[PDB]
Amino acid sequence: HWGYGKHNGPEHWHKDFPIAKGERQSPVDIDTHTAKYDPSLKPLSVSYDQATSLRILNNGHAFNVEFDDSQDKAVLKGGPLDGTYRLIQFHFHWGSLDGQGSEHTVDKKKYAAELHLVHWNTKYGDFGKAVQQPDGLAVLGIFLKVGSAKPGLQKVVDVLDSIKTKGKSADFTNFDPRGLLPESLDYWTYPGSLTTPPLLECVTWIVLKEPISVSSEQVLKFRKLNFNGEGEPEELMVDNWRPAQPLKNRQIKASFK
Numbered sequence: 001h002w003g004y005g006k007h008n009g010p011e012h013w014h015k016d017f018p019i020a021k022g023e024r025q026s027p028v029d030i031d032t033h034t035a036k037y038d039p040s041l042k043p044l045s046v047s048y049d050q051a052t053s054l055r056i057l058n059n060g061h062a063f064n065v066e067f068d069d070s071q072d073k074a075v076l077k078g079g080p081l082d083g084t085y086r087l088i089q090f091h092f093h094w095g096s097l098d099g100q101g102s103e104h105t106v107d108k109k110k111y112a113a114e115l116h117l118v119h120w121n122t123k124y125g126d127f128g129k130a131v132q133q134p135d136g137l138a139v140l141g142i143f144l145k146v147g148s149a150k151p152g153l154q155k156v157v158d159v160l161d162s163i164k165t166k167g168k169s170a171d172f173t174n175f176d177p178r179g180l181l182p183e184s185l186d187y188w189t190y191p192g193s194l195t196t197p198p199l200l201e202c203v204t205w206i207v208l209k210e211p212i213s214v215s216s217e218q219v220l221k222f223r224k225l226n227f228n229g230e231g232e233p234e235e236l237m238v239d240n241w242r243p244a245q246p247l248k249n250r251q252i253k254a255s256f257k
């Protein structure tokens with residue numbers, strides 16, 4: 001159905017998902033000179049000590065590392081958020097070359113990739129209910145630039161050969177997502193949407209200012225994945241990012257001066 005090619009990519013999504021042209025779509029460009037410091041914003045609380053990763057899945061658009069979200073084990077709170085949001089999965093968006101790949105941009109700069117740690121508001125009971133609410137999800141976004149290797153990413157990189165094609169999964173227990181964070185939790189925040197269909201306007205976005213560095217070899221392995229299923233013509237999983245969407249009547253707030 002939808003995808004990232006010329007015939008089914010982001011410019012086509014509105015025909016099946018008319019919210020694609022909505023009032024709070026993501027991603028957006030973060031204009032750093034226009035984002036206002038909000039001293040009312042609290043420090044983020046990232047509590048991943050008890051995270052329970054389970055499985056890694058190639059879903060035909062990215063790969064997801066899935067977590068046990070049946071209890072409050074890995075949660076995001078504070079910052080702009082009211083209440084408690086449970087980690088359900090993380091995934092990335094990346095490019096065919098290092099000069100593109102991120103979904104959010106910073107003063108129009110594109111990073112090589114972007115990590116999304118996806119959390120749902122426990123007041124709605126399950127993820128499917130949460131996505132129907134304007135405050136249902138919180139996605140923590142982290143930019144990736146190419147330079148030195150990220151040691152905490154290597155366990156992900158090394159399993160990708162086992163999930164090359166759409167629909168393949170592999171056991172992925174005991175992975176610590178704290179190894180994917182940068183040092184600083186300074187962030188920008190704004191109300192937005194899922195960046196893939198169904199594009200629901202249910203996300204509080206929290207985008208960290210500090211990128212993580214990954215090595216060229218690490219991102220090259222991302223680019224060896226396939227959008228296609230096994231025994232189908234090979235289409236490399238690259239450029240699985242949606243471009244920036246109109247900001248409309250929204251303000252991006254900064255946690256830092």
Ligand SMILES: NCCCN(CCc1ccccc1)CC(=O)N(CCc1ccc(S(N)(=O)=O)cc1)Cc1ccco1
Pocket residue numbers: 116118126127128129131139193194195196197198200
């Ligand atoms: N059983 C198959 C799992 C598929 N799940 C169902 C999970 C579920 C849990 C409890 C109750 C019902 C369903 C749907 C799902 O995960 N999607 C991807 C969601 C998603 C998340 C982050 C981003 S992003 N890039 O913005 O971070 C973009 C999209 C599609 C979707 C559908 C509706 C909203 O989304």
Ligand SMILES: [Zn+2]
Pocket residue numbers: 091092093116195
């Ligand atoms: Zn995403």
